[PDB]
Design a protein around this ligand. Sequence first.
Ligand SMILES: CCc1ccc(OCC(=O)N2CCCCC2)cc1
Ligand SMILES: CCc1ccc(OCC(=O)N2CCCCC2)cc1
Ligand SMILES: [Ca+2]
Ligand SMILES: [Ca+2]
Lengths: 204, 204
Amino acid sequence: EEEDAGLVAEAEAVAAGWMLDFLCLSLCRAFRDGRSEDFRRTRNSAEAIIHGLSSLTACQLRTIYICQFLTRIAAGKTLDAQFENDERITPLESALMIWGSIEKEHDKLHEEIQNLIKIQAIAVCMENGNFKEAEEVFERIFGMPFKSKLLMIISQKDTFHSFFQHFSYNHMMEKIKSYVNYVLSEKSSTFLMKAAAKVVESKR
Amino acid sequence: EEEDAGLVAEAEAVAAGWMLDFLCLSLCRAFRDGRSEDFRRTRNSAEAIIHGLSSLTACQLRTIYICQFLTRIAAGKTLDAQFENDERITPLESALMIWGSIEKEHDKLHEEIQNLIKIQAIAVCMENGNFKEAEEVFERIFGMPFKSKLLMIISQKDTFHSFFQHFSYNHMMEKIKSYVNYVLSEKSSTFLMKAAAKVVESKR
Ligand SMILES: CCc1ccc(OCC(=O)N2CCCCC2)cc1
Ligand SMILES: CCc1ccc(OCC(=O)N2CCCCC2)cc1
Ligand SMILES: [Ca+2]
Ligand SMILES: [Ca+2]
């Protein structure tokens, strides 16, 4: 009776792990495709499954970090969203913290995404007329030539500066989608998706 | 590209169906065991997965009805919970509506559970001092000898009447748990649980 209960709990943990990988893959695909409503609904399912998991492997923590990173990027222009206990941290600042914590290679693409999130974290404040908040985000992030241009734009209150058009929100999204394509290729072979794909193929 | 997107969506529907059955089995087990917090967390996961499913088979609708029925029974004493668009309907009345909609045999146990939910739907109002609400629940449900005793208890404001101790909330819960055991036996062979169980067994 107690051994049965324990074996059932172990099986529920195995199934939750399979469900987390599948939901991460669905979330990545919705982000890549721009399917806003599917992303919202999948994020809700991923959060609920995560609250039912206790012990995590290094791989499951990385998968969770990727889900959290994409959620903050999707909410990057929503300055009323509070993702951290410190209410001053903006969504792109929260995405930057996660980006620097994921156990992943620090290749050229990693650094390009990092710097585009930093510029846009300031740009989104400027675009909403939040000039003092842009200065505070700048101080938290920066924590020389790149830093100096940003402080100049902030002090001029140059909301639609040409610098923000060369390192735009769309360019940040496109670089992030390139990274998402690599996660989709790596997780396409996860148990639930493979089994579901085999079922669909066998009926064709 | 469009055929690939369509095949991916079909696989996501297959996986969501497997996830719904697994979450129903986990929800049933938490209800049977009295694991209140696991029931709450599993209900959250089941609701989110359900919102990501569009077309349902007759079997999936029955599985969803069972999840909804157990949620209303678990909230039976929570008279501030509103499960229907009509705010007057109490949680046990909402459970009674679902019980009469499930495609299932109407054996002796089905009717015993039905009548215990009817008595308790009135009993829970009386126990909270809501005498006028008990009369209104009575009129919505009833909709001869059984009906007459209840109307007499309601009019006397006999909160802790002996009739409610013979057909108690605990007796209703125990009869419902007997039914839950049959659902657990029928869904223990679902894809995700079987595969998870095989993994756990292979490591023993
Ligand atoms: C957006 C997806 C999401 C993910 C997790 C979460 O809460 C849990 C949480 O933060 N951790 C921290 C990381 C390890 C798991 C527990 C809420 C929402
Ligand atoms: C408690 C579990 C739960 C289940 C379903 C749900 O909403 C969806 C809903 O009602 N239907 C009606 C029945 C068919 C699916 C759509 C909310 C919570
Ligand atoms: Ca804010
Ligand atoms: Ca009420």
